[PDB]
Amino acid sequence: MALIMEPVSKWSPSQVVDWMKGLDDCLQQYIKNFEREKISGDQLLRITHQELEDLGVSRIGHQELILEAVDLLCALNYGLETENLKTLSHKLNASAKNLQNFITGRRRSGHYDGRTSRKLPNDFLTSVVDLIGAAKSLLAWLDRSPSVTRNNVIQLCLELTTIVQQDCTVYETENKILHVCKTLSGVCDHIISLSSDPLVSQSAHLEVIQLANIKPSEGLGMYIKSTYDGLHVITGTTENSPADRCKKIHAGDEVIQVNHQTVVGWQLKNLVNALREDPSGVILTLKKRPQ
């Protein structure tokens, strides 16, 4: 929300380079050119391949690093105000439906050899994987809100993983996957039907929270996990800590800015540096769950 934070689309080139300084060491060689071209948060959110190449980024590993950061930037600018449990459930049911219609589709085509081949096409893996992603996202949202049914999805996602690893004909692999698909959805519907109708549509918000240290460079007293997806997530605080007493930092919160600097795609290293910079306190912009 524009009261707590200024849109990424409003960032100046300086603001762009600033956030770029906390990304991977191997990408700094480029910020010189981003500078010179006056690349703004505007253009950044939609940077294209050809643009990355003109900025000097040939090694598409380096490209992918940048775009994975900018993808996170997009989740923040468009998604935070938007993503709710309904959204997430729709995305899960959708990727399962599409998988199903994929399977039954393949099977009526003239070129089908699924009853003979055990060679599983790459479509299948990307689909299965993507669906498992949808289910993990649903569950990461469920944990920060109001156990049996949590194991369900986990098992179901696992049944998927073992299905595509079985030295199996593809018709049988397809029957097995088709089954997981139908039930995974049903579980998803059930999770929804069991959900309070005020929370189920609410999305997350931002908050500013100011800490005050009481000794030079003291522990603020929070524990922070940095997910592979890039997230910096507070997992808990410690008693009699600034963080604990402020009553405003909670497990599940995600560090969005540190001292008014967006640290979203950052390497733990540089986030750590950010948090430590001022021994006297820290301003945290936290992504807060609707609960």
């Binding site: 191997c26 040939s58 090694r59 598409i60 590993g61 380096h62 992918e64 690093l65 994975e68």
Partner: peptide, 8 residues
Amino acid sequence: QHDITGRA
């Protein structure tokens, strides 16, 4: 040539 790391 393209520096394909794990994440990449």
